[PDB]
Design a protein around this ligand. Sequence first.
Ligand SMILES: *[C@@H]1O[C@H](CO)[C@@H](O)[C@H](O)[C@H]1NC(C)=O
Ligand SMILES: *[C@@H]1O[C@H](CO)[C@@H](O)[C@H](O)[C@H]1NC(C)=O
Ligand SMILES: *[C@@H]1O[C@H](CO)[C@@H](O)[C@H](O)[C@H]1NC(C)=O
Ligand SMILES: *[C@@H]1O[C@H](CO)[C@@H](O)[C@H](O)[C@H]1NC(C)=O
Ligand SMILES: *[C@@H]1O[C@H](CO)[C@@H](O)[C@H](O)[C@H]1NC(C)=O
Ligand SMILES: *[C@@H]1O[C@H](CO)[C@@H](O)[C@H](O)[C@H]1NC(C)=O
Ligand SMILES: *[C@@H]1O[C@H](CO)[C@@H](O)[C@H](O)[C@H]1NC(C)=O
Ligand SMILES: *[C@@H]1O[C@H](CO)[C@@H](O)[C@H](O)[C@H]1NC(C)=O
Ligand SMILES: *[C@@H]1O[C@H](CO)[C@@H](O)[C@H](O)[C@H]1NC(C)=O
Ligand SMILES: *[C@@H]1O[C@H](CO)[C@@H](O)[C@H](O)[C@H]1NC(C)=O
Ligand SMILES: *[C@@H]1O[C@H](CO)[C@@H](O)[C@H](O)[C@H]1NC(C)=O
Ligand SMILES: *[C@@H]1O[C@H](CO)[C@@H](O)[C@H](O)[C@H]1NC(C)=O
Ligand SMILES: *[C@@H]1O[C@H](CO)[C@@H](O)[C@H](O)[C@H]1NC(C)=O
Lengths: 49, 49, 197, 50, 99, 246, 49, 148, 148
Amino acid sequence: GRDEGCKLVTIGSGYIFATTGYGIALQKGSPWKRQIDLALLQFVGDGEM
Amino acid sequence: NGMIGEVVYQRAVMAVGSLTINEERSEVVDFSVPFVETGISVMVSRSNG
Amino acid sequence: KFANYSIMNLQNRKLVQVGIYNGTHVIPNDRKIIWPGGETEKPRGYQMSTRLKIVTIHQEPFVYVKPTMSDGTCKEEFTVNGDPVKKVICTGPNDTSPGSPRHTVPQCCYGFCIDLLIKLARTMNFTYEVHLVADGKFGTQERVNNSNKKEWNGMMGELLSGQADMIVAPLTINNERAQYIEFSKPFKYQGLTILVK
Amino acid sequence: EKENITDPPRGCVGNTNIWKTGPLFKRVLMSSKYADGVTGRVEFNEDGDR
Amino acid sequence: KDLSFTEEGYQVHPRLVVIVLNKDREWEKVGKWENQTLSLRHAVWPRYKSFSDCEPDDNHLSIVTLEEAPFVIVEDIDPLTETCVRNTVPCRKFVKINN
Amino acid sequence: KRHGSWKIQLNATSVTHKPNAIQMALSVCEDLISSQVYAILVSHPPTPNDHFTPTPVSYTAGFYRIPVLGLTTRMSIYSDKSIHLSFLRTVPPYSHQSSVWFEMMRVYNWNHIILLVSDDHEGRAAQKRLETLLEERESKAEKVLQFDPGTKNVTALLMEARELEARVIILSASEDDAATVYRAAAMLNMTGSGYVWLVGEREISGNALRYAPDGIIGLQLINGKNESAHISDAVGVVAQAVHELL
Amino acid sequence: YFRRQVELSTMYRHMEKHNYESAAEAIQAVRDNKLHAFIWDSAVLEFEA
Amino acid sequence: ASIQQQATVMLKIMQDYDWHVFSLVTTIFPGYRDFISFIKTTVDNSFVGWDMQNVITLDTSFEDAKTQVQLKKIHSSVILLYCSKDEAVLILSEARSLGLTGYDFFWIVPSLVSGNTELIPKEFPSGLISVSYDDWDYSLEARVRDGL
Amino acid sequence: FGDDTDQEAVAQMLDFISSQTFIPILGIHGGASMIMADKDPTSTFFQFGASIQQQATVMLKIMQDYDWHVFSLVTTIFPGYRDFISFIKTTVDNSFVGWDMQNVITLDTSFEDAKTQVQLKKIHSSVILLYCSKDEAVLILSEARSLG
Ligand SMILES: *[C@@H]1O[C@H](CO)[C@@H](O)[C@H](O)[C@H]1NC(C)=O
Ligand SMILES: *[C@@H]1O[C@H](CO)[C@@H](O)[C@H](O)[C@H]1NC(C)=O
Ligand SMILES: *[C@@H]1O[C@H](CO)[C@@H](O)[C@H](O)[C@H]1NC(C)=O
Ligand SMILES: *[C@@H]1O[C@H](CO)[C@@H](O)[C@H](O)[C@H]1NC(C)=O
Ligand SMILES: *[C@@H]1O[C@H](CO)[C@@H](O)[C@H](O)[C@H]1NC(C)=O
Ligand SMILES: *[C@@H]1O[C@H](CO)[C@@H](O)[C@H](O)[C@H]1NC(C)=O
Ligand SMILES: *[C@@H]1O[C@H](CO)[C@@H](O)[C@H](O)[C@H]1NC(C)=O
Ligand SMILES: *[C@@H]1O[C@H](CO)[C@@H](O)[C@H](O)[C@H]1NC(C)=O
Ligand SMILES: *[C@@H]1O[C@H](CO)[C@@H](O)[C@H](O)[C@H]1NC(C)=O
Ligand SMILES: *[C@@H]1O[C@H](CO)[C@@H](O)[C@H](O)[C@H]1NC(C)=O
Ligand SMILES: *[C@@H]1O[C@H](CO)[C@@H](O)[C@H](O)[C@H]1NC(C)=O
Ligand SMILES: *[C@@H]1O[C@H](CO)[C@@H](O)[C@H](O)[C@H]1NC(C)=O
Ligand SMILES: *[C@@H]1O[C@H](CO)[C@@H](O)[C@H](O)[C@H]1NC(C)=O
């Protein structure tokens, strides 16, 4: 999406690949974890993401 | 090393940036919920043809 | 405020004082915490969930539901790759309650999430029981006839009532469901789209 | 009519501590509302004028 | 010492002193001023967790990240006013002298 | 003695038992209105009437909003500030025992709990206090139960509790209901090993003490039946409050 | 109008290099391929097209 | 120093620390209209895009009824107080009483608010940011020698 | 029995009569018909009126017909209040309207006009809901006329 030359249309859409997500690493037992999860689901749950 | 070494040795609270999800990180720290669908892919030469 | 209480034990029809309690602090004495079973130690009475109750909805790419062959049996059929279809004896209703009056039978369930559950049973040593949901809904925060209170129905309603143990379904992970129960990490990354002709 | 009646002391002999109810007495002068007077209805505004 | 005067009777180049309070009830001399620009000794600002007796501060979250182009765009500070533009956030980067 | 040289004096008024509670409240209000009293102390635990109703005295004093400092009862109908308006006391109710039970959760690191209450009046307040305690840890109980006392076929609910995966049994009931569920527990394997029995003080009196399983853990008040020193502390509280009001 | 905007400061940091005096400067600069883009009112550029 | 140069230095500190959400609280203590006007122009001069909460103005000695409402309107990070020294003690004691002395709640005052470094009163948070020029390093004997 | 005064506890006394005489007693007017908190199945006393939840439903139906969505709730500890506040909170939780409910102003005792004035000056909504006794409401309305 920023390529100069535009010779790059990638292999599929992630079919045969790792297929993971991105997350936030916290300490094992942090009290912030549930609140951060609810905040991320609020940020996806309104189209702001 | 890196952000994992900063969080496990507790010189930081959390890591916000792009971070993959595998077994050893879930052993040493705790991920949040995933917010973006980001797997892996392969960029090749992919000429005109 | 700050009520001193006494912690008593009944040692064979005899009241025995085995502790005290301050306004905020428990003080055990030098007596024996005698239990009705074995040792004086605490019984960790949290069983490891040997038998599990699995509920799902009729999801055509995930849960194929098919009536049995003769009586409660499942035919070992093959795929295009020669894979034997690892089925399970699920128990579910026939149709909706206006549709079917009362017909809840064990039938054969297979497909995607059944194979996922069999992989999970290969991972950890446990047993399970696959069953179905009474209605045909996922579950929403829906009103009830009294109390001015919305409760849960569907698979969430059957799980929060204690009738189930683990929902294996395409769990639409949103903010509302996460406020009440804990989740797993998503096996499937899947969005929304529009079906047209 | 109010409380904390304090007086400005003999500040010309060894006293530099200010009179603490200065702004209090000034606020008393601010709320000076009157309807009598040969010059007329006298009352102080927020700037302390006629 | 350029002790020149303005039209209102003020020093053209005075000595601006920036102090704070420690827990030892002392005014610590922190920052002085040059002829034009501000001199700050502590680039990392000390948080001073105990302003008073009872202050449990559990809301200062130490956060580290990694430089990647579609997510973490890191640039230098502005050369004109030495200011991050307001749609960005500040950070510090530890750079050693040599090997 | 030590409350200054204030010019107030004191006088006593005390009324005894009558079987008819109507004439009890009649003699009470005759002694309250004609004396212009300030503080009222109800001090009858061992009444042969099993209703245990100091209600009309507090309702007569609440007609002009006079605080009665009771000394005997521990019910949620008296703990409420809605119906009983200003009926204060220096005795704790049973619901705060759940807080102690939450401290028991902080003793043995026990999380998954099961609640069984025969009553509904105190049971809702006990459920609210216990859910407040669980919200302080941000967790939930596995199963809570409220029902109607009197019957004997609550054994099926105990067998459903057997089908659960926690063994923490928290009970709140009167004497006869506790004896009934202890008989059901003895007839359904529930007095063996692993079971967690943690009750209050109503379960260790009468036949509830008789049919209790050997090894049960319970709570007890301190200076709960010592009533004279309770009167003395109440009079000290009342006298210092009256001097502070004057 | 771009200075009131809350997120287009990158365009402000880019256009500060080539702030031109007259519009004919920009017309001659894109005419001699010195520029690559230019923001202007519509009908003026419609006439100059 | 002038009040204008000192306000410029304090806004330079805020520029170096990027505490963009702030307020401005003044009494009728003198040198205040030019101070508030210089702050308003400097915010209007800035392309930084500062977040300025509205100016709280204190009239007289507090009844802690209207001034409590004026102090409970404050929800920003940096509080700029411009008053006398005793009024600074009173306002900080009220903010400590009202809980307005938190970790978020910063306090940057000039020299005329703070006063002499030889005496430090109570009701001060450990971290009270101030700008003065009563240096114990650059001695008073050096000051009078430079004046001579 | 129909009472002329403003004392609902009279009916509570009648409730005690319903605990003793076992007579079906109908509260007709005034405090005999003023709604108490929670009756008893052993009591055969009955009033003429509606519950506080039904009248709350009527008032929220008025607010629904008028679209006065930004509202508040000023409550003392006058009884029947926990169920009323709980009913309002559940109605906000059961709202397709999207009711802008300002947080509940609470009154512990009679007003000191020091902290209660702060809770009254936090009101920035349109509909101010009051639930207390008679003379307490007269004092609160006189304070609101005093506070504008
Ligand atoms: C309750 O018990 C201990 C020992 O009696 C006492 O020192 C303290 O006041 C209480 N607990 C605490 C807070 O340590
Ligand atoms: C279950 O539903 C189907 C719907 O066609 C019906 O044909 C079948 O008879 C039902 N099963 C029984 C035996 O009730
Ligand atoms: C089966 O589960 C038991 C616990 O009930 C465990 O001890 C055993 O190791 C498991 N066996 C295997 C091979 O999974
Ligand atoms: C009560 O609940 C049922 C559930 O199906 C619903 O159909 C009905 O509309 C509700 N209302 C009544 C009549 O109480
Ligand atoms: C005088 O003012 C102070 C506050 O400056 C106040 O605390 C006190 O109540 C007032 N007067 C007295 C001594 O009551
Ligand atoms: C207003 O003008 C009139 C006429 O001069 C005179 O009474 C006086 O100067 C002023 N004051 C008032 C309010 O009467
Ligand atoms: C301070 O003065 C010196 C000359 O004495 C000059 O070189 C320097 O640039 C001045 N400081 C600044 C950075 O303004
Ligand atoms: C010393 O600094 C220079 C850049 O100023 C560069 O060669 C390198 O960063 C350092 N030397 C080495 C070899 O690390
Ligand atoms: C310095 O040089 C060595 C050469 O091997 C290299 O391994 C190391 O990473 C460099 N970094 C340090 C220690 O500054
Ligand atoms: C105290 O009260 C009684 C009535 O209860 C009455 O005789 C008189 O008011 C006082 N008498 C005594 C005993 O002081
Ligand atoms: C109560 O009811 C059940 C119903 O099956 C019956 O078996 C028994 O009489 C009671 N409970 C027990 C002991 O199973
Ligand atoms: C449990 O109770 C049954 C009777 O219902 C009895 O036969 C059995 O032996 C008991 N089992 C245990 C664990 O003692
Ligand atoms: C109650 O407590 C007091 C405390 O001193 C004690 O003297 C008394 O003996 C106890 N019991 C009685 C008989 O009142």
